[PDB]
């Protein structure tokens, strides 16, 4: 349901606005730390000059960037957004890619392996129905990607004024090679993204992700998983969560609720220079797997 694509859907960047591509009002996202934001609250109001096309360019060449997109909701202000529309309606699970000057629906998870889509944004649903959508990009991207969202207010009319059509284009350039960590496996995508693979039937080497200051770690957890003490209750062999052990580290997908990819990532800060040797575990339902994390050995 949330991930349902319509293969027959077609649109264009300009939509039905009659604006040629040379006349788009292009601008960049408001980038702060690792959060790139395209806010349309003030951009799409009905204007005399409208309909104008306003394109927000999200250019990503770094890992673990979070993209927030704010699209004003119908009725947030009376009359000004009465006929607003957003595309795809199943964003961010569904995005638009350019195929022959045409935009068609594609699953974002198949475009970028490892992409984290949380179910909630600020404890509201992660859907344009709540006005905001978010997704975190992975620590590794191999092929360049370009996908689009639409937040179109051009059909809204107020006296002689008309709203504007909003376009967000996310441009991901390649970055990274492999993720320091382990993939518990049963595609080639699962095998090539992590430095160590752990097979279920006959394993010799348990999970050993070796981190240093500035490095990114990750774990692809087994599909069948009961619980894990990994990154919240860790055992030093030299304040038990990794956050408490490494001040200002960040763990992505703490709650393991992201769709598709059962992964969480860790970022060791460049400041952190002390040495640490930790243990956590992964429980299956059916045995359990041991995880050894070393930092700055």
């Amino acid at each position, epitope marked *: 349901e949330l991930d349902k694509i319509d293969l027959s859907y077609e649109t264009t960047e300009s939509g039905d606005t009659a604006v*040629s*591509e*040379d006349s788009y009002d*292009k*601008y*960049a996202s408001n980038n702060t730390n690792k959060e790139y934001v395209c806010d349309f609250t003030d951009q799409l109001k009905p204007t005399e000059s409208g309909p104008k096309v306003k394109k927000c360019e999200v250019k990503v060449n770094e890992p673990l960037i979070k993209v927030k997109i704010i699209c004003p909701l119908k009725g947030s202000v009376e009359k000004l957004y009465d006929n607003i529309e957003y595309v795809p309606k199943k964003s961010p699970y569904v995005v638009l890619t350019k195929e022959e000057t045409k935009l068609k629906e594609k699953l974002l998870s198949k475009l970028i392996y490892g992409l984290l889509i949380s179910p909630t944004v600020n404890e509201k649903e992660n859907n344009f129905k709540e006005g905001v959508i978010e997704f975190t990009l992975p620590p590794v991207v191999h092929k*360049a990607t370009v996908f689009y969202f639409i937040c179109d207010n051009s059909k809204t009319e107020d006296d002689n004024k008309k709203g504007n059509r909003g376009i967000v284009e996310v441009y991901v350039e390649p970055y990274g090679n492999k993720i320091n960590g382990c993939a518990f496996l049963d595609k080639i995508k699962m095998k090539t993204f992590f430095t160590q693979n752990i097979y279920k039937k006959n394993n010799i080497y348990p999970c050993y992700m070796k981190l240093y200051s500035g490095d990114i770690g990750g774990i692809l957890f087994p599909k069948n998983i009961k619980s894990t003490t990994c990154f919240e209750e860790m055992i030093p062999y030299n304040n038990k969560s990794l956050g408490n052990l490494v001040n200002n580290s960040v763990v992505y997908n703490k709650e393991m609720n992201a769709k598709y990819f059962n992964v969480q990532y860790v970022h060791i800060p460049t400041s952190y220079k002390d040495t640490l040797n930790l243990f956590c575990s992964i429980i299956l339902k059916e045995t359990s797997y041991l995880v050894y994390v070393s930092i700055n050995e």
Partner: single-chain antibody
Amino acid sequence: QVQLQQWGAGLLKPSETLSLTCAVSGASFSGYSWTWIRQSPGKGLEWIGEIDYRGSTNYNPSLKSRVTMSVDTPKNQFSLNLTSLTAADTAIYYCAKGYGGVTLVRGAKINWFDPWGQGTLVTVSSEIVLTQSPGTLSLSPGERATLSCRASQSVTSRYLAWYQQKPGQAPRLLIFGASSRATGIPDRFSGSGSGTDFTLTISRLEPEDFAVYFCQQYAKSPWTFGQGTKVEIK
């Protein structure tokens, strides 16, 4: 209402340093590639380099040694510094707004230049090659003009633009994507072609349509122009 104010010292001795600055208004300084372009007598149109709001640069390999560009994003300005000046650097320098659109084609950028600045004459005194044919068309009003632009190597996609330069003015964009009319461009201007062969067709000439027409490719950096085709009366 995109305006590009341009200023800088124009009368310089050899070996001195040229410094031009351009100020943007009516457009968001983020989201375009602010470029410099010069038009020299004989040499023709030449792309110098580009810079965005983040400070990232791309320079022409020919001028790469002597060219430096900067941005002062607060004031929405960007600047050029050409060094080791010679007489061959005498030309009209244009501030220009490059579209700067992203493409999955490598080495390519959707980077036709529109609008251009008014131009600054700099006087020194004390690759994909596009070949346009003809060099000169002599025709009367109401007749059809057909111009050709041929590239030394295939232009990926249809990443070609055409420009019109009326006498005494800066170029203005006519066509982008080989065959897409720009905003405010009459229907009598039609573009066509793909690969290495492109044409610009002016179906029913009118007295002001007598200008110089250039093609530009943005499929492989450095962005290059044709030598021009002059359209005149007969």
